[PDB]
Symmetry: C3
Subunit: 333 residues, 3 copies
């Protein structure tokens, strides 16, 4: 009887941060309560000022990372305020049945719904909006995020030993398809209905105009760079709801990676770069060994440096000259 179980209300945070949780479950199974409010909003996604009509869970691209343990129940209150214009729903890749919940969570503006599902499989998973007939449009408008279902005894390495992270970040990578005119400039649209056919045309090119982390070019840079200290263990959860990516920590590695994100599998060790297929979340665990600026990218470097799929870590601490040093600094022949 699910009513006999503890209920715990989670208060979500904006990516790339992650709400408070315990790696190792400190209670038995729980009903873990989440509320997300759908927000359609304009977002500026690049340095040029390109503005799109984004479709968000909880106001962000990506939507927030939800965290539970295996065999918890996830109970989501999904709210579609009447300030929105479109119907939305949600497909949880962590869930079993009804198109991941999509068939049960169709909410018009001015409606809400509450879905519960049992999180039977441990891993990081994509969640995304998926309204019948307009699935890729919602997803590539930003309407996706991820959920992490931790093993009840936390993460393990390839030998069954504990892996415990000190910090966790969630990098949502978004492929956008801003319609272009024949000369190559972005078009603008008066209504979602008027935008739809040109959105479809743009999607069918299979060529994103923008590929961004945390909803915009440069979002995880400057004062919003990711941070860590030398010696800290960091888990980076990375999702891509629609298109393949290949994450890479420039200057580091994925010490332990679940590239397709499912923790009953042993991790791959020492990855330089890993492929997260579109429609998947993956997770990489790294212990920083060197201070300084790192760049965290999709290692299609065009996608990273021209289209936006690059963020930074600023790492504090001691430099280790045994691990790397400039023996002779750049100088003239």
């Amino acid at each position: 009887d699910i009513s006999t179980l503890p209920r715990v209300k989670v208060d979500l945070v904006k990516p790339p941060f992650v709400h408070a949780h315990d790696q190792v479950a400190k209670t038995g199974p729980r009903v873990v309560e989440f509320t997300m409010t759908i927000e359609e909003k304009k977002l500026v996604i690049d340095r040029e000022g390109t503005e799109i009509h984004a479709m968000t869970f909880n106001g962000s691209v990506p939507g927030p990372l939800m965290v539970v343990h295996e065999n918890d129940y996830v109970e989501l209150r999904l709210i579609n305020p009447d300030t929105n214009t479109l119907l939305h729903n949600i497909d949880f890749h962590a869930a079993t049945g009804a198109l991941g919940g999509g068939a049960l969570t169709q909410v018009n503006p001015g409606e809400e719904t509450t879905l519960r599902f049992k999180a039977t499989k441990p891993g990081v998973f994509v969640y995304h909006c998926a309204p019948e007939g307009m699935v890729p449009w919602h997803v590539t408008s930003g309407m996706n995020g991820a959920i992490m279902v931790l093993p009840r005894d936390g993460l393990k390495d390839e030998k069954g030993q504990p892996l415990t992270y000190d910090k966790i970040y969630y990098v949502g990578e978004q492929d956008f398809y801003v319609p272009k005119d024949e000369a190559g400039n972005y078009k603008k649209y008066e209504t979602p209905g008027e935008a739809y056919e040109d959105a479809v045309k743009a999607m069918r090119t299979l060529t994103p105009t923008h590929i961004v982390f945390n909803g915009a070019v440069g979002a995880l840079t400057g004062d919003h760079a990711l941070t860590a200290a030398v010696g800290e263990r960091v888990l980076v959860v990375h999702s891509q709801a629609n298109r393949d990516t290949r994450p890479h920590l420039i200057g580091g590695h994925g010490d332990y990676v679940w590239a397709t994100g499912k923790f009953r599998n042993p991790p791959d060790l020492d990855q330089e770069t890993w492929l997260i297929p579109g429609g998947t979340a993956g997770a990489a665990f790294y212990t920083f060994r060197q201070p300084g600026v790192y760049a965290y990218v999709n290692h299609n470097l065009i996608e990273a440096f021209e289209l936006g799929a690059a963020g930074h870590f600023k790492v504090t601490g001691e430099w280790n000259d045994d691990l790397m040093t400039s023996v002779v600094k750049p100088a003239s022949m």
Copy 2:
């Protein structure tokens, strides 16, 4: 002496069905005899009525799934009737030598050949036509399928325990490159020779016009949806002879997946989505837990919902409200 071995004649079926076989070999090694007849034919591939000149093994896109056991011999009689206009051959990725058999199976219209190879490696494998100088043209005209080489003791999980499927389906995914004029409409062609240069141009865009399951948009929907019952164990073999895909069961998982299709490797567990590289067959084993309509897609959702890479399962049985339920149905604030 191969002549001392049993010979068994297989009678193939049209995808997504699979000819009768035993998971665990009930005999010693056999020469397993297959006949396929090449058919060049017009096919309508979308709802608009777009008609292409397809190149098929046995009249279907994909060609049929062939099933043997490890260390059986596959003996294929390949027939190219004089009603066809082109030369064809076959590359079995399961085979060793002579370009997978391609160098030994060049048949002009009005010819046939018989190839034998030993199936030394267990797995699902792509087979495809590959005539020197026109390889991608044949493959992206539909001229590919798959062969499953089962371990003699059937499939095993990651711990060495048996995995036994109740039902098997074969999903062949086809990237087509229908040539477009500058305005974006599909062109039509009088002869394969006249079509060739525009086919090459279209292929070189690396942007499929269509990506379909079982040879057409909607082929695995309606009365031709895949079926299962709650509690049934289903193996879905999925091939892509030319281009990456990322399969996903919307509402389910791959409980055990061999993403690159080779059964001497332990499967990956609990996959949401998995990458089958172009030129590969993969296999996913799932036990259904919920009834209803599922969609089985390439989770590049543009490729699925706009370009055609989507099919359905209709699953019968009991709904499990513990696993998923609508706590509060969509209703007004």
Copy 3:
């Protein structure tokens, strides 16, 4: 004290060959000294005579394979002669800190630098140039290669048994983005500065004009085909610094594959085709069983046969009719 360690100078060779090394380390840790000289040069990359301004390490695309053992120190003298016009540097994916060395190795024409890093992780790894603000331009101009960090006790199979190769080759796969005019012909450029914007435009299409092995269409064919004998164990290291590939030995397999290239992981067995993500090196070990011509391809067959990603092996030895035979040669009905 690194000064107390042996120093060994390596003399590099041009791909696809690999400098002399020992699989199992015959000494303790060493400082392994490499020198590479940057060369900007014109290269003809196709049969049409298309000429690009390539950016190379040591005069080749790809740059040479460097080989060390785990816990050796790699000490690279990187020379940028004043005959070059651009600034360059190097990111070693094998290294930890300073953007893989990129932050420490910025050399203008007429400068050199020496970088040392400890090779703490075994695997094959990409190295590439990565100057701030022009990273994909350098990489997709050919300025990348690979480094293999062998386990000190050489390679192991999935059971911990030794795998010893008889021959090793390095296949560097390069995506080029030669700018096109609206009619589709390649443009030519007077200076790297004048070329830059059109290079960026071309890259942003995400559609390579050329995808080649060893720097040109047909480079690993004819008198420069790879060779082997029946019964020889061959390791093929394959890198792609910017874009996914899917290698396949036509007529063979990857008996043991580290698709993402890191040797602390067990290899995948019996691969037909494997995905090397862009920004990664992978390695495939195969024992040849049949003589003849093999084709080694990216199994996006358009990328292979139309865009250039195909090479050959010529294998000498005995044909095995048990493994494959033509039972009935192509003949008329």
